Design an enzyme around this catalytic site. Structure first.
Site, mmCIF file in Angstrom:
data_model
loop_
_atom_site.group_PDB
_atom_site.id
_atom_site.type_symbol
_atom_site.label_atom_id
_atom_site.label_comp_id
_atom_site.label_asym_id
_atom_site.label_seq_id
_atom_site.Cartn_x
_atom_site.Cartn_y
_atom_site.Cartn_z
ATOM 1 N N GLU A 65 -39.920 36.044 24.484
ATOM 2 C CA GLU A 65 -40.617 34.895 23.927
ATOM 3 C C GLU A 65 -42.011 35.312 23.491
ATOM 4 O O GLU A 65 -42.635 36.178 24.108
ATOM 5 C CB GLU A 65 -40.692 33.768 24.961
ATOM 6 C CG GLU A 65 -41.634 32.626 24.600
ATOM 7 C CD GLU A 65 -41.053 31.691 23.551
ATOM 8 O OE1 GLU A 65 -39.810 31.593 23.457
ATOM 9 O OE2 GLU A 65 -41.845 31.068 22.807
ATOM 10 N N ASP A 93 -35.884 34.200 26.853
ATOM 11 C CA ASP A 93 -37.319 34.363 27.051
ATOM 12 C C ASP A 93 -37.701 35.720 27.625
ATOM 13 O O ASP A 93 -38.690 36.311 27.186
ATOM 14 C CB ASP A 93 -37.851 33.255 27.971
ATOM 15 C CG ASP A 93 -37.658 31.863 27.383
ATOM 16 O OD1 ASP A 93 -38.055 31.664 26.212
ATOM 17 O OD2 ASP A 93 -37.109 30.979 28.092
ATOM 18 N N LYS A 119 -29.382 23.413 29.521
ATOM 19 C CA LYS A 119 -29.525 24.836 29.219
ATOM 20 C C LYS A 119 -28.254 25.613 29.555
ATOM 21 O O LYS A 119 -27.894 26.563 28.850
ATOM 22 C CB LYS A 119 -30.733 25.417 29.951
ATOM 23 C CG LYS A 119 -32.074 24.923 29.430
ATOM 24 C CD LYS A 119 -32.722 25.983 28.535
ATOM 25 C CE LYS A 119 -33.937 25.460 27.770
ATOM 26 N NZ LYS A 119 -33.664 24.953 26.386
HETATM 27 C C1 SE9 Z 1 -41.185 27.725 19.596
HETATM 28 O O1 SE9 Z 1 -41.353 26.545 18.852
HETATM 29 C C2 SE9 Z 1 -40.155 25.952 18.431
HETATM 30 C C3 SE9 Z 1 -38.956 26.566 18.761
HETATM 31 C C4 SE9 Z 1 -37.744 26.025 18.374
HETATM 32 C C5 SE9 Z 1 -36.421 26.712 18.746
HETATM 33 C C6 SE9 Z 1 -36.591 27.943 19.658
HETATM 34 N N1 SE9 Z 1 -36.957 27.488 20.986
HETATM 35 C C7 SE9 Z 1 -36.888 28.223 22.241
HETATM 36 O O2 SE9 Z 1 -36.521 29.350 22.350
HETATM 37 C C8 SE9 Z 1 -37.364 27.405 23.428
HETATM 38 N N2 SE9 Z 1 -38.048 26.180 23.089
HETATM 39 C C9 SE9 Z 1 -38.557 25.297 24.155
HETATM 40 C C10 SE9 Z 1 -39.288 24.020 23.778
HETATM 41 C C11 SE9 Z 1 -40.014 23.964 22.596
HETATM 42 C C12 SE9 Z 1 -40.686 22.800 22.261
HETATM 43 C C13 SE9 Z 1 -40.639 21.704 23.114
HETATM 44 C C14 SE9 Z 1 -39.916 21.770 24.299
HETATM 45 C C15 SE9 Z 1 -39.853 20.572 25.254
HETATM 46 F F1 SE9 Z 1 -40.597 20.847 26.372
HETATM 47 F F2 SE9 Z 1 -40.346 19.461 24.618
HETATM 48 F F3 SE9 Z 1 -38.555 20.356 25.641
HETATM 49 C C16 SE9 Z 1 -39.246 22.934 24.632
HETATM 50 N N3 SE9 Z 1 -38.374 25.666 25.577
HETATM 51 C C17 SE9 Z 1 -37.687 26.894 25.920
HETATM 52 O O3 SE9 Z 1 -37.560 27.163 27.060
HETATM 53 C C18 SE9 Z 1 -37.166 27.799 24.852
HETATM 54 O O4 SE9 Z 1 -36.506 28.990 25.175
HETATM 55 C C19 SE9 Z 1 -37.801 24.837 17.647
HETATM 56 C C20 SE9 Z 1 -39.032 24.262 17.344
HETATM 57 N N4 SE9 Z 1 -40.168 24.821 17.736
HETATM 58 MN MN MN Z 2 -37.322 29.065 27.404
HETATM 59 MN MN MN Z 3 -37.416 30.956 24.290
#
Ligand code: SE9
Ligand code: MN
Ligand code: MN
Ligand code: QQ4
Length: 180
Positions: A65, A93, A119
């Site tokens: 990540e 990650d 997840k």
């Molecule tokens: C990075 O920016 C992003 C990413 C994506 C898709 C790829 N994402 C991941 O890989 C991922 N993303 C999250 C997460 C991101 C934003 C909000 C939240 C929440 F806390 F609101 F749920 C969780 N958490 C993880 O653990 C996790 O692995 C799409 C858009 N934007």
């Molecule tokens: Mn994550």
């Molecule tokens: Mn991630």
């Protein structure tokens, strides 16, 4: 454009973490000026990932990540091709070199049960480890193998509750909670 949440993110998190969250959000078609709650969420997720990678030994973890998409996939490919683990369908990650497995870190505002269920429902290949922290101090890992020792995890939980407190002090916490 600007909003209290954005300024709070900028003042609460490390500048490199903020730049990384901004780059990821732009790359994924989001806007930190407008989607300020997601801004805070990805900053927090990044910080948690970094603290976790700091919790082991020197060569313990490989951080996936925070890298851009192509390089992150490149390094998981190299890891798969040198170890033999299967390619995760979705980007994880971390990678544990001591336990030889990918790690999916989640940070949730709700019960760790629900989020862990989501997840584990997306990650079809159950090989990759899953570890959820909540903003209340709960945590939940796969097969109850929480990987790191107690002190590192407690440091993560303390910081999470600090962020939550700082948000509630500015009356920003209700919106953040009712956004996940
Ligand atoms: C990075 O920016 C992003 C990413 C994506 C898709 C790829 N994402 C991941 O890989 C991922 N993303 C999250 C997460 C991101 C934003 C909000 C939240 C929440 F806390 F609101 F749920 C969780 N958490 C993880 O653990 C996790 O692995 C799409 C858009 N934007
Ligand atoms: Mn994550
Ligand atoms: Mn991630
Ligand atoms: C390696 C480098 C950037 C790293 C970023 C990440 C930051 C880490 C720094 C720690 C130590 N400390 C200690 C003093 C203050 C501080 O901040 N932490 C952890 C908590 C918050 C934070 O900031 N880490 C982890 C390894 C060493 C390092 O610096 N990243 C970014 C994503 C991938 C990665 O490995 N790289 C590598 C090439 C490109 C690049 O940028």
């Amino acid at each position: 454009r600007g909003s209290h949440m954005e300024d709070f993110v900028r003042q609460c998190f490390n500048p490199m973490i903020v730049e990384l969250a901004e780059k990821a959000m732009k790359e994924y078609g989001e806007d930190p000026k407008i989607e300020t709650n997601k801004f805070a969420a990805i900053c927090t997720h990044l910080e948690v990932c970094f603290m976790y990678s700091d919790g082991g030994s020197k060569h313990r973890f490989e951080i996936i990540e925070g890298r851009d998409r192509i390089m992150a996939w490149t390094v998981v490919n190299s890891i798969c091709n040198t170890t033999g683990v299967e390619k995760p369908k979705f980007l994880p990650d971390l990678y544990d070199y001591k336990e030889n497995r990918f790690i999916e870190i989640g940070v949730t505002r709700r019960e760790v049960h629900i989020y862990y269920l989501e997840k584990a429902n997306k990650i079809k290949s159950e090989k990759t480890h899953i570890h959820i922290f909540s903003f209340t101090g709960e945590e939940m890992a796969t097969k109850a193998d929480y990987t790191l020792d107690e002190e590192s995890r407690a440091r993560i939980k303390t910081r999470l509750f600090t962020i939550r407190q700082e948000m509630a002090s500015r009356s920003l916490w209700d919106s953040f909670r009712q956004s996940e």
